[PDB]
Structure formats: structure tokens, C-alpha cells
Amino acid sequence: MALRGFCSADGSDPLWDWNVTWNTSNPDFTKCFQNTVLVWVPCFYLWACFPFYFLYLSRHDRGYIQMTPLNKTKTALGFLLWIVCWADLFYSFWERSRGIFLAPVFLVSPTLLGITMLLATFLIQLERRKGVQSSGIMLTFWLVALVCALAILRSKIMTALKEDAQVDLFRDITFYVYFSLLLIQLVLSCFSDRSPLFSETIHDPNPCPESSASFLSRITFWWITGLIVRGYRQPLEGSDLWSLNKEDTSEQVVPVLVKNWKKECAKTNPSLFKVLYKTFGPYFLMSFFFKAIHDLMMFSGPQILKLLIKFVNDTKAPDWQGYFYTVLLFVTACLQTLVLHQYFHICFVSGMRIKTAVIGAVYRKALVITNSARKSSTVGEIVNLMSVDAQRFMDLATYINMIWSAPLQVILALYLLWLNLGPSVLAGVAVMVLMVPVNAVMAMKTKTLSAVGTFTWVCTPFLVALCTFAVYVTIDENNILDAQTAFVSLALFNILRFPLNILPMVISSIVQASVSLKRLRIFLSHEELEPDSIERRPVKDGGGTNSITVRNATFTWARSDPPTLNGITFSIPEGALVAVVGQVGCGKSSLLSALLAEMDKVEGHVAIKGSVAYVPQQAWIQNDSLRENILFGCQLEEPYYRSVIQACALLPDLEILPSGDRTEIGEKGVNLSGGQKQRVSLARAVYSNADIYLFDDPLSAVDAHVGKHIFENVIGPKGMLKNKTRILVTHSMSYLPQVDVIIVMSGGKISEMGSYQELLARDGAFAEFLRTYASTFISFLSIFLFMCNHVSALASNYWLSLWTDDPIVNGTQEHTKVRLSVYGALGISQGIAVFGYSMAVSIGGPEVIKMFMGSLFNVIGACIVILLATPIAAIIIPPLGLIYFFVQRFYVASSRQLKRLESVSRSPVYSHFNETLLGVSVIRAFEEQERFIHQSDLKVDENQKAYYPSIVANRWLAVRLECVGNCIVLFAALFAVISRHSLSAGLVGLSVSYSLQVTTYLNWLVRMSSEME
Amino acid sequence: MALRGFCSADGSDPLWDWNVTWNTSNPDFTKCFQNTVLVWVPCFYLWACFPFYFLYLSRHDRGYIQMTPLNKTKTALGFLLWIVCWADLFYSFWERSRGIFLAPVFLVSPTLLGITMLLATFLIQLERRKGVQSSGIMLTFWLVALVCALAILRSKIMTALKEDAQVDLFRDITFYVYFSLLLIQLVLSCFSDRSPLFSETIHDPNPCPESSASFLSRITFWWITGLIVRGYRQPLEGSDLWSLNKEDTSEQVVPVLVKNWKKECAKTNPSLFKVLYKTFGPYFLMSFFFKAIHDLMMFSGPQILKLLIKFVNDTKAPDWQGYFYTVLLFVTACLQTLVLHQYFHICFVSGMRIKTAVIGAVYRKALVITNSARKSSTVGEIVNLMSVDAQRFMDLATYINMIWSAPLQVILALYLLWLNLGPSVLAGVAVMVLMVPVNAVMAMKTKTLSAVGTFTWVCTPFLVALCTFAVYVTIDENNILDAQTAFVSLALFNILRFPLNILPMVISSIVQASVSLKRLRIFLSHEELEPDSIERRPVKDGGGTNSITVRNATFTWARSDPPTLNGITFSIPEGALVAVVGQVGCGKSSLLSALLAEMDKVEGHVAIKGSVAYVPQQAWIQNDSLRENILFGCQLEEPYYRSVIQACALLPDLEILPSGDRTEIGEKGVNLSGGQKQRVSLARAVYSNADIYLFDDPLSAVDAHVGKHIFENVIGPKGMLKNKTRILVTHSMSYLPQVDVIIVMSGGKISEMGSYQELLARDGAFAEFLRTYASTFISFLSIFLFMCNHVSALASNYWLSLWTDDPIVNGTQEHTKVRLSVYGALGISQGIAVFGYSMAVSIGGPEVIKMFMGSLFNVIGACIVILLATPIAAIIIPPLGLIYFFVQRFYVASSRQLKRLESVSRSPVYSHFNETLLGVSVIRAFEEQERFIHQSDLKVDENQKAYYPSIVANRWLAVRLECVGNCIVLFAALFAVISRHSLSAGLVGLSVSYSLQVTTYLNWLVRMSSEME
């Protein structure tokens, strides 16, 4: 209560009077209020946002924009804005000192403005130093200060020329100068800044323009209009799209997630969503504050409307009041559409940023890890995990914020409806519960009346309103239907309807996401890094005499099975032909694979020296050129290519092919034979030019006569690779005598080792093997029904408006029985007509034309109602009938060509992953597993360059189609307040109510039932 | 008088009447006036501009802009606008047919609007067909129609909502739709068109943007701001300039003038003047119609000011009148500055287009015509005709339109002043004749206190005003100095002053131009075509046996002299060495030159064969590379270059040079000896590789040994040119015996011809010749004086304002004879102060700082006066104190770098013309005179590319610095009309008078006293 004594020494200027600002014909604020609150509010606004902005900006150094003249003039203006406010205080000090008592108010309030201006000037310099072009804080502060100064300027201009007023000629000049400088700075603080000294774009010439735009352009999504119009004439395809900004690329996201997951695993299990909470968490806290505010802006629509009606029925209030509400019907309807469409963008971006990391984390955990423990099917169990489970992590991101906002709106709307009407709404909302069976009906239709059901859905607002009003009127008495009662609930029900629709289908989505999480987690922890290290590396030393060393080796396929190899110990020098002999199923494959770090060793010491080349019995070919398949990464070399082709004898195979060594080999191409595949693999192996070669019956399917030249050309001692180490396994008989050393193993143990001559002289197991084997009319009806239904609805609304304005005498209002009778009769007629045209269209037939005609006729009716209420609105119909039109044609011809590129670019990632998963066994032997990781990175990135601008073109139109909807309410309220002396309450209520339901029906027509056709 | 019965049957709605539009508190037009005149005016405006536009556009086909959607929508909008106006007439016909008498007025107007709408729609398509992007007629028509319809809309909105009247609901909707469509079309018809299918710019990538700009941009000169801003930071030089538009080039103007002049000469200073008038007449006639509107709008300021001053003194007129005049103070002050600056551009372009044609005509006449009759000096008589006479043909273009507008303004202003004041102004204007002496004074100050002279010039308006008012108030006593009398004449004198000063220096310029015309015509009429046809061409036939044929030849140097050659007849075969022998002054040079078609023949037959090479005794070198000088256009050839260098023996000369054959030879370079020059010319001649060679003592200054070596190297029979025809003349005593045929001539007649042996055996005159030639402290004082003078002027103005508002009692102005005394005393004090600071600045010394300080103090006073008159104007001072500033700094730093390129580019054309005039003889001997015309063309075009945008940057600032001046009058009248209840007439008069004189003093500061220092 100190303000009363603070304002003056007599208490004659109370803060609020209610007799000077509201009840007069010329409102004007008092003195103390103007001096204190209007001055203080900007300072409090800015002083509570400086530490947060400073802390946020202390981590985002980006540039050094040096000496633009804008920074030279803005600093000067900010410094000049301080000296006048200081001079005011200096003059006040003089006046106090000499002879005048002036109260402490003049000695305190001015001194804060100087401090705030000094802080703003310093912030401009810091903002320039940290290098950001457009500012989102200076604009708002300048706007607020300008409005607060405009109020005082109007008050002073009104009180100046009243009657011979005595005003000191030292506070007018100061305030006028201050206001002019504020206006100049507001204009000047929105142009641009030149550029940072250095930027990321040094080589790529096509960057996205989002990094360089003004605050208003980013708010209104204007920078996307560049490539939309260009898509209308010139077809859109190829490199016309932009490039990423080096932040969403897969090379800068996956390592962070994999490191955090590895650290969490080493800490110990909680699911990976626990890690995602601490990785991608601080970007969802901005998507929670934006939603709630929007919700509180939804219920400022009806209330104002109610007030307006109460103003029309009063015939003695001052006129200007009717202009105070209308302005508030424009700001509130404007700030609501500039907040939701930013929360949507944040949610979509943070939901897209997760899939590009999960995909990479899955891929990097398959090619080099989880060996010998993979038992799930190769198709539909691993590849499906890349296309279905990871694709259900964007819906959850958008829908996770609808779990608590769904019941809040319902509770608030029910409370307001109960406050307005009374207990009857409990029955009325019961009808709302009674049409929960209607959503049950559409659900069971989806399981399996569709048109009949949707027309009952269309008609159900009428049914619920009629039932509510009948219950309100029939029960009890002495209740009169005013304009507010019958014209507020109609909007409240429409607002409340949507959350009762959104509640289903969400609880199923959450369950499905939770189910998918279990599978993702069980796969990401499906191993314990089996091939960590058991060998002496494929190549560790560049020089040695003994190639393969092994002592006391023992390996097993699985940890729960008896060992298959025991007591394995041998040594082999360099450049010796070693051939092993074993029976079918003896275990040759297991021993052969144990050398490639594909087994589990319990005890033993084994080592190899030099890079290895592997030729498995099964061959795989990547879908590419035969030249590329043979080269396998290495560049061409002549006549090395000719030499290796001659050695492999590929001349007939190259000649028979339609284009030689350039056709489509493998899948999605011509089919070959097994022998040709084996020859191609052998050619690739010999081209690899390794130190040790490891074969596995590479000539079984090749004809023996044909394979004779191959054996005598390369494998035999006459070949060009006689200086390397060769290992060959087979069950052939002919090639045994020409090898150097023969090793025979059975029962998991090696029996004898030695040369062919020594084994033959011994006449032991080899002799026994040789001896045993011994192989050495409806259109016009539909139109008429449409017209009947629409005129029935219009007559219903007109009759309700006429009824709501009946005079009140002796409690009741004349007659309240015939109105209900005619209302019910017309409702029954409309219900008959809707089913009649339902049957007509069902017999004639579809839904696209249905909704198209419905929306067109409804918007025509919405226009004609406003035309009938006031004959001056016809000025604004033409100009608003064109701006919308040009929006509905650019979007259809530009969002239909960007929805086809994704279907083209989707397949390659899945195909590449399937190929890698099928060829991992051979890909790991060559020690070439980084190139493939890089390769599968450049295809996912190509599916996120043509997909990012396919959703912004959805946040464009939606914004552009809501300003049109909100520019009719203002002009239907302003043109109705001017002529309050001749308009009843009902007509104003109808005109205002029909202007709210235009944006929904305008947006429905453009998206659905237009692009489909 | 038919309108009275046309409006209505009983004539109850007459035409204009002051009882309903002017004397009321709510002005509103009547019914018949609204129905007829406002509607009819647009139709008459457009219907009187269609044939002219059609005729002008039927000759300027430029493109085929095909199917822009703007042309698709504008036609539809026009066709829609037609139908509503037709429907109005249809409904009127129905109403007249059924039961209603409605008068013929409703049956005429719609059928007259429909025709205009259809014509506009057709004109859009016709405009599209001929390919013009921006239209200057559609915008004006739409604006006029909208302005006319605004009043009808206001009346129909005012008469409907209030008074509870009855309005038919069939004419409101039609008019509202019509107004909305008009607004939409006005907005839509000012964007752009796409492009013509083909344009001139196919190769050059830097065209001037003037060919592609909107109407508003062309009017406001907003396409030169692109490079003015760019030149501030990056230095301006080189290729940053644009290119011509293929219309001002010298290859497309000179032929037209030369053809017209030749035709006029063949028909037979009236001749040249008539030819110029017939050639460039059409584009100058547009300059007469633009210096008529501005002259009339000049006199619309004093009338409005007088009306406003009279209105302020009235305290019962309705308030809104004060807002009708102020708007008229903005349109009139705006249309005046958008007309003069469009006449200046046309005048300057027409002035520039003449010099580029006169220069080309003179050059094409000089080189190949007027031979043997040139007697004027080579310097200062012909070259001066290219730089002085043709440079005085741009001032005449601008000043020729000031010969009749100078006295018209004087006469009109004198008549108005006499009407306002009376006979006293005749005495006062006599005192205004009294500065005819003082301008004569500065005239003699130009011939030989000058600061004192200009300070008396500054004080002159005060002196003449004081004398006029003293004379007005002294004689008799019948008139009282009101506000209008003392505040209209002050502006009228200032308006009238300038033409009284422009009149001198023009009559001298006209005389000088008339003098220059005589010399230009006497040189251009100097044709006297010498080389018409006298020879058989230098080369006509490619095959023959006799080289030179001559019979009965006779030639003379001049037509008024006895012939020097008579009885010349001889013949020589192909490849014969012919040497002629003559005495000194015998006439060898005359006969030698006669063979080159440099003489005139009265009788005889002479003929030559094959292209000729000429080596005159005097050699000329163009300032270029020695390689280019020797090549003379031909490309280099090896080892031809080495062969000719060895033949000419140029090895020591090339070796001794600092860079060999690459130095700067000739003028502006190193000097060379005469022998080297002769050797260079001989090398050029032999490089020419002609059929007939003609020498003239080419070894006079050459050393005897060097000359002998050259003679045996090339000229002698052992040389490489023995197969062609050689002619040599000399007086040497050694080379005669080795020649084939010797010809001796004397007295103009050839005596004997024959071989050396025959002549020696004859022992005639040859033996005689042989034997004959064988025998042989103030700064602060200046500041104080400045302040005293300015406060004295301010006190003078304030005292006059106080005096003019004295009450009138008994016919007299209270008591006079006391204001005049103090007025004169303060005037004398101001004169003493200005003389004192004159002496101070003369002793201390300059003019730049003088005018700078004067303008700064005057412009600060012009703002302090407005601030004192009304304390609310302080809002507008800051924002207008910045827009001007940024204009003053860009222009100074961008028009100082474009005023230096001309000084660089001026010299080459004069230097090239001098070189050509000195080399004419050799340049014509070689039959190479077409390349040099192009060479001299390519430079005058380079002097007109950096000069065209050096004057538009003067029409930019002047436009940008007059809207600031005209935006203070509006805000000083509006802020003074609001508070008429507390302001006397004197303060309003002072404020409005001082607000006019701000543009002149703002423009004076930027151009002078700023750029100079």
C-alpha cells in the first residue's frame, strides 16, 4: 500500500479509478500509473532474459563479422538514447535543489532507462562478436518499448491542446526525441548483416538458405517459396535439390550414440531409450513449453465472442468499446498459428534425427561383430529390423506429447460448459458419450454403412445440440434461451470434439512402439564381441620362414558342444604345396574355417604370417560391372589384366557375353553358370595378389578336362604364383601325386604327415585309402438432394437465431412449443434426405467427389450467410477469392513431384544391406570392411536430402491458409459493430459463429479430395 | 442548359451549388453530378489517347512474349468487369419496361462504361503482341478510375448506415464488386512481364538495366543505385561500367547524317541548320511540352499559402477546410519535381547525340577527300575543330529552350505583384532593376571586395523588401500591412529572382555557337572531290605486259597556275629498271606524285597495273610496337621475317635497342636516327610484297657503305625483287651504269629515253650532264560576427511578423513610424557586421568554408524557427536528419571516381586524329583507309561509355534531395492547422515561408563547398 503515498503527498491519484479509463467517452490513463508501470515493464522484460541469452551464446562461436556500418550506427544511436534520460534526471535534481518539492518518483523511474539502454548497447556488440546475423530478442524489446511510448504520446497529445494548459517545455522535447529514436531503431534493426569471415560452404555451391534468413522469414517459412514456383514450369528432378548443412550427416551422429551405449554397457540392463534420453533429451524441453501456451490460446476465442454479444444487446454503452474487443480478436487469433507450426517443426526434426542414428548403429553391429551366434532368418528378421522397426520411431516422437494434453482440454471444456449451462450438459455430453459407439461403429467398419456412418457423423453436432436444448427447455422451467447460451455452446462443442477423436489409435501406437523396442534391444545386445582377437592378426610381420604355426589347437563350433578339433599341431615352411585329405563330414570345413578367426579357441597357440586370400566353395557377386567385380577396388593394370584373363582362360566367356566385360552380372542381370562363377572368383583371388592362398575345392562344378588347363596354368608348379604359400583342400584323386606334402586327418586328429613318396613307401593309411576307394438419371437427383440438405441446415440455423431473440414476459418467452416441433420436423427431413442421397450415390457408383462437393457447397453457404447479414461484406469476397486460389494450384503441382523421389530412393539401402549380410563371410577375409561402411553411408544420406524439403512444403501451405481464415473474422466483426443500431443479437451471433468454421473447411478441401483426383 | 431537364423531370437535383458542398459541416456531392461527371471523366481520358498510342506502337515491334499467366488473368478480369456494367443496364431496362419511369440517365452511363472496358481489354492484348513489359498508360487510367470511384463509395457508405433510409439492394452489390475488381487490377498491373523471345543481348553479358525496368523505377531513376553503392567500398575502375545499347554507337548514326547532307547538297547558315532540324527534329519537340507544365505549377505555391493565411485568420469556418488545402500543397509540390528532371534527361541526350555524328562526319571527310586545297594550319585549325567547336554543341542544346521562358515568368510574376500590392511595386521593381548595376559589378569583378559583393548580394532581398515596404507605407495613408501582403511578396520576389539572372551569359553563348557554325559549315562544304576518277585504279587487271602507259599527259598543282607537265608520253615493259634524272627543282617531285592520283589531269591517257608500294622521302611512324609498325596489319611469317630483316640489315639496330623489336618507337618513346627511319620504311615496303615499287631517294642520309650494301642486297639485280617493276629517282653519281633504262626530263618535257649504252654512244645532253656533275585571433571574432548577423536576421523576421499583426483602429495601424526606425537600425547593424566579418576573413585569408558555414547556420535556423513556432515538430527532425546524411556521403565518394575516367579517355581520339592527318599520304597510297575509320570509331565509343552514367548520377541526388525538402512543408502546415485556436497569423506565415526556402539551401551545401574541399 506504499504506492498511495509514493505517487504524491495527498493520495489524490489512485492507481486504478474505474471512472477515468472505462466509464467515460474518452478513456485515458491516470498519472502515477503512466509514470510507473508503463515505464517499468520494458525494463523488467529485458532484465529477465539477459543471463539466459548470455549463457546460451557463450557456446556458439561462429564468425567475426567485422565492421559493417550498421554496427557503427546502431551503437551510436544506443549511446545517444542514454544521454537524454540522464539529462531528465539532472534537470529534476536541479529543480529539487533550487526551490521545488517534486516527490521521489521523478528521481527514481528515469534512472533505470539509462541502465537498460547501456545493457542493450553492450549486448549488440557481444552479438556482433559471436557472429549471428538476425536477432530474435532486439525486435521484441523494441516493439514493446514503442507501444508503451505510443500510449504516453497519445495521452500527452490529447492533454496538450485542451484549454490554455500550462505544460513545462522541458519534458515534451525529451519524450518526442526519445520516441523518434525508438522508431528509427525499430526500423533499422531488421535489415541484415553482411556475412561471417569464414563459413562451412567453401566447396559445395548449393547450401540450404535456412542458415541465412531474417527472423520473420524463418517464422513464416518464406525461403521455401524459391523452389516451389520454379517447380511449376520446369520439371523438378535431379540436382535441383539442396544439400545438408553438415549436421544431419551419418558421419557425425552415429559415433556419439555408439560411444554412449558402450559406456553404459561397461557401467553394468536399461533399454537404449535410457541412453537416448540423455543424448537427444535437451531438444525436447523446447517442444513442451510451446504446446501448453497454444492450448491456453484456444479458449480465448469463445469468451471474447460472448462479450461481443453482450455488448450488442446494450444500447447505452460508449461506441468505442466495440472496437476494443475486435482488435483482441486479431492478436489472439494470430499468435496461435505462429506457435503451433514451430512446435510441429521441432518435433518432426528431432524425430527424424533418431532414425539416421539407429540405422547406422544397427549396421555397424552386424558386419564385424555377432559371429557364430546368429540364428534368426536372414530375411524378415534382420533386414526387416531396418525398414519396419526404425520406421516406427517418427510417429512416437510426434504423438508422445498428446498423452497429457488430450484430457486437459476435455476437462477444461467440460468445466466451462457446466459453468455456462448447468447440469443439463452432463446429459448432453452423455450424448457425446453416446456417440462413442459412433467411433466404435467406424472402427468395426474398418474391421469389415460407411457413407451412412460418415453422414451420421456429419449430422451428429445437430443431434447433440438439439438433444441438449430439448433437455434444457423441457425439464424444470423459468429458463430462457438467450443469445450467449445458444451461441457459445455451439462453438465449445466443436472445440471439444477433436480430442475425443484423437484419443483412440494412440494407445495402440504406444504399445507397438514398446513391442519394437524389445526386439531392437535384444538384437543390439545379441553377442559379446566373439571375434575380438584369437590370432596373431592376418598380417603382423613382413618376414619369416615358417608360414603357418600351430600347437595344441582345439576349437569348437559352440560353447555348449564337445570340441571338434583336438591335439592339432604342425608346422609348414614357406612356398610349399600342402594338400589335406579327409572323408565326407570328417571336419575339413571346421578346421579350414578355424584359420580365418571364425572359431572359438579354448587352449592352444596358432599364428600366420602375411595377408591371406580366401576362395570359399560358395561364390557371391555384387550387382555391378564384371570389370568392377574382378577389380574389387584396385585400379586396372595392363597387360596384367590380359595376363590374368589368359591365366583364368576367360576369353570364351568374355566373347559370348553381349558386351564383353561390361554387362550386368549377378542379380538384376543376366544369369551365369556355376563354373563361370567359380572362375570369376578365382580370377578375383589371383588379382588380389596376396601372400597366402586358401582354396576350397574350387573346381568341383568345373569340368575335369576344362579344369585341367586351369590346374596346369596357375595352381601347378608351372604357374606364376609358385613363390607364395598355397593351401588346397578337396577329395579329388588325380592331383594328389603332384603335390609336395599331404596331411591326412580323421576323428579330429591328424594321423600322418609327409611327402607323397614317404607315405607311399610307408603303405599305411594312404595305401588303405587308395585300396578302398580305388578311384586313382442420378446426377440431378443428387444435386436436388444436396440443395435440399443445405437449405434445410440453413433454415435450421436461421430458425434457431430467430427463436433466440424472443421477448421475455412473465418469466417465459411467448411460445416455446411450436419451435421445437418445427425444429424436429426439419431435422427428420434432413435425416431422411441424407440417407436418400447416400442410397442414390451408392446405387450410381466416389468419396473424392463427395467431399469436394460438400466442401464447396459449405464454403458457398458460409459466404452467403455473411453476405446476407451485412450487404457491405461483398467488397472483400473477390480479393480473398484469389489469394487462396493461387495457393491451391502451386502446391498441388509441386508437392506431387517431391512425393515420388522417395519411392525411387528407398530401395537401395535395403538392397545394399541385404547384399552385405549375404557376403559378410568373404568380405571379412580380405580385410576390406571400412569401404563398405562408407558406401552404405552415402545411400542413407541420399534419402534424407529429398525428404527434408517434402515436409516443409506442408508447413508452408498450412500457414498460408490460416491467415485467410483469420482475416474474415476481423472483417465480419468490424462490419457488424459499426451498425449495432439496426442489428439484433441473433444476426451478429450467426455471422460471427460462421466465420470460425471457415478455416477448417477451407483446409479440408485443398489437402484431401483435391490431390487424390 | 439541357442538364437541368436531363437530371430529373422536375429538376429537383440541379448541378453545382455552394449550399450543400461548401457551406456545410459535412461536404457531399449531389446526385446528378455524381452520376454524370465523375463517371464520364475516365472514359473521356482514355478515349482521347488510343489513336496516338496505336499509331506510335504500330512501328516498334520488339518481341513476342508468349503465354505469361498475368496476361491470362488480366483478360479474364477485364471481361468480368464488362459483364456487371452490362447487367446494370439490363436491370434498368427491365425496370423501365415493367412499371417504373427512371429517366434516360440510367440508360446511358453503363453502356458507355462497357465500351471503355472492352477497349482496355483489347489494348492489353495489343500491347502484349508488340512486346513491351512496362506500360505507362494502364497505371494512370486505373489510378484515375479508382480516385473517381472513391467519392461515390464514400457517399454510398455514408448515406446507408445512418438516417434510416431505403436503398435498393441491386446497385450496392454491383458497385462494390466493381470497386474491388478495380483495386485488384490496379495492384496486379504493376509487377512485370517475363521477357521477349529474342533480344539484342546474345553475346555481351553486361547490358544497361534501363531497357528492363518498371515505370516507377524509370521515373525515379532507381536503377543507378546498383553501382553507386558498390563503388563506395570496392574501387571503381575498368570493366565495372556497362555497355551501350546499340543505338548511340558511331556506326549507326554518321551514315544517316552524311547521306542527308549529300542529298541536300545535290539538291542545290540555312543548309546545315535545316539538315540538322530535319534529322534530329522529332526527338526535341517533346522538350517543348515539358517546359510548360512546370512553369505553370511553379505559381501554385503563393496562392495556396495566401489562402491558408486568410483561412487561419477566420474563426468561424469549418475545421475540415484546413485539411483540403494542405493536401493540395503536396500533389502540386510533387508533380513539379517529376517533370523538370524528365525534360533535363531528354535535353541532355539530344545534346549528346549530335557530337558523336559531327565528329564522325568530319573524320570521314578529312582523310579521303579535300586534297590539294588544304591551306589551313595542321594544328589549331583542323584538330581544334574536333575538340572546341564540337564541344560547344551541348550547351546550346540545353540553353535553346530558355530564350522564351525567361521573360514569360518575369511578366507573369510582375503582373501578379502589381495586382497584389499596387503601383508601389513599379518603384520597387525599379529598385529590383537596381541590382542590374551590382551584377554588372561582379561582371567587372570577373573582369578584374568580391566577398563584400556577395555579402551585399545576400543582403539584397532584405534591402529591396525594406525599400518596398517603406514606399508602400510612406505615401498617403490608406492601406494597412496585413499578413498576406507582407508574406506573399517575400516568396514572389524569390521566385522571380532567378530568371533575371539567367538572362546574361546566354546571349553570349548563342553568339559563340553561331560563330562556330560558320567555320564548321565552311569546312564541311570544302568537299572539292579531287580523287573522283582520273586513273585506271591502282590495280584493275591482274595480267599485262606494259606496266606504265602514258600519252599526252599534263598536270598542274592548282587550277589557277600554268601547267608544270606537258607532252609526257612513254611506255615501259614488265620487270624493267627505270631511273629518271633531273635537276634540283626541275619538277621530279610533281611528276612522281602525279602517278599516285594526287594530281588533276586536263587531257591525256595514263594507266598503271598492279598494286603499288610507295616510299616517300619523308617517313612517319605510328606510336606502337616496331613489330606492328613493320607488319602494318599482316601477320608474322617465318623465316620471312628473318629473311627481310637480313635483307634490310637490321641486326645491329635490333640488338642495340633495350628490348629488341618491342620498344616504344616514334612519339612517346625513344628517338631514332633518320637512317634507321628510312630503313624501317624500306623494310615495311618490301614486306608489303607489291607488284610495282616506287622509291624517292631512299638512301640520302644512309652511309655510303651501308647504302651500297643495301643496293647490292635488294634493289640490285641480285636481289629477290628482280621479277617486279621498280621505279627509282635520285641524283646519285654511282648507280646509273647498272640500271636498264634512263629517262631525262627538263622544263616539264622528257628530252631523251634509252639505255645507258645508247645514251653514252649518242654523246648528247647525257654526256654534258655527266661531265658537269663529274667536274664538281580571427576564429572567435568570425564566429561572433556570424552569430550576430544570424540573430539580427532572425530578429528582423520576428519583428516583421509582430508588426504585421497589429490591430486596426480608426483606419490606421495603431501607431506606425516606430517599427521602421528599429527595422532600419537593425539592418544597418547587420550590414556593419557583415562588412566587419568580410574584412576579418579577407585579412585572415576560403570561399568553401564561407559557404559551408553559411549554409549550415541557415539550415539550423530554418529548423529552430519551426521548433519555436510549434513544439511538436521535434518528432520529425531526427528521421529527416539521417536520410539526407546517407545521401550526402555516398554521392561524394562515388561521383569523384567517375569524374576522373573522362580525363584519362579524352586524349586518345585527338592524338589518333593528329596522327592520321599527318600520315594521310602514305595511308592512302597503300589503299588501306577502311581499317583506320574503324580504329578511330572504336575510341569515341570508349569515351561515351564512362560519360553517360556520369550525368545520371546527377539526376539521382537532385531527385532524392527534393522529396526531403517537400516533406517539411506538409508537416509544417498540418501541425499548424491543428492548433489554429492559439496561433496568430504571423507565426503561421513565418513558419510556412521559412519552410519553402529549405530545399535550395540544402541542395547548395551538398554540391558546392563539400566536393571541392
Swiss-Prot record, chains A, B:
Effect of residue 1004 to C: Impairs estradiol glucuronide transport; loss of resistance to alkaloid vincristine, cationic anthracyclines, epipodophyllotoxin VP-16, but not potassium antimony tartrate; partial loss of resistance to sodium arsenite
Molecular function terms from GO: ABC-type glutathione S-conjugate transporter activity; ABC-type transporter activity; ABC-type vitamin B12 transporter activity; ABC-type xenobiotic transporter activity; ATP binding; ATP hydrolysis activity; ATPase-coupled inorganic anion transmembrane transporter activity; ATPase-coupled lipid transmembrane transporter activity
Outcome, altering residue 899 to R: Reduced transport of glutathione
Glycosites: 19, 23, 810
Catalytic activity: ATP + H2O + xenobioticSide 1 = ADP + phosphate + xenobioticSide 2; an S-substituted glutathione(in) + ATP + H2O = an S-substituted glutathione(out) + ADP + phosphate + H(+); sphing-4-enine 1-phosphate(in) + ATP + H2O = sphing-4-enine 1-phosphate(out) + ADP + phosphate + H(+); leukotriene C4(in) + ATP + H2O = leukotriene C4(out) + ADP + phosphate + H(+)
Keywords: ATP-binding, Cell membrane, Deafness, Glycoprotein, Hydrolase, Lipid transport, Membrane, Non-syndromic deafness, Nucleotide-binding, Phosphoprotein, Repeat, Translocase, Transmembrane, Transmembrane helix, Transport
Activity regulation as described: MK 571 inhibits sphingosine 1-phosphate and leukotriene C4 export.
Residues at which ATP 1 binds: 557, 582-589, 617
GO CC, one annotated term: plasma membrane
Record EC number: 7.6.2.2, 7.6.2.3
Effect recorded for residue 508 to A: Increases estradiol glucuronide transport
Location(s) in or outside the cell: Cell membrane; Basolateral cell membrane
Impact noted for substituting residue 501 to A: Increases resistance to vincristine and decreases resistance to VP-16
Effect of residue 896 to E/K: Strongly reduced transport of leukotriene C4, estradiol glucuronide and of glutathione
Positions of transmembrane segments: 34-54, 75-95, 101-121, 134-154, 173-193, 276-296, 323-343, 400-420, 424-444, 452-472, 495-515, 777-792, 830-845, 848-868, 870-890, 962-982, 985-1005
Cytoplasmic side: 55-74, 122-133, 194-275, 344-399, 516-776, 891-961
Result after altering residue 847 to A/L/N/Q: Decreases resistance to anthracyclines
Highest taxon in the source lineage: Eukaryota
Every ABC transmembrane type-1 domain range: 284-512, 779-1013
Family designation: Belongs to the ABC transporter superfamily. ABCC family. Conjugate transporter (TC 3.A.1.208) subfamily.
Protein name in UniProt: Multidrug resistance-associated protein 1
Name of the gene this protein is made from: ABCC1
Full protein segment contained here: 1 to 1255 of 1531
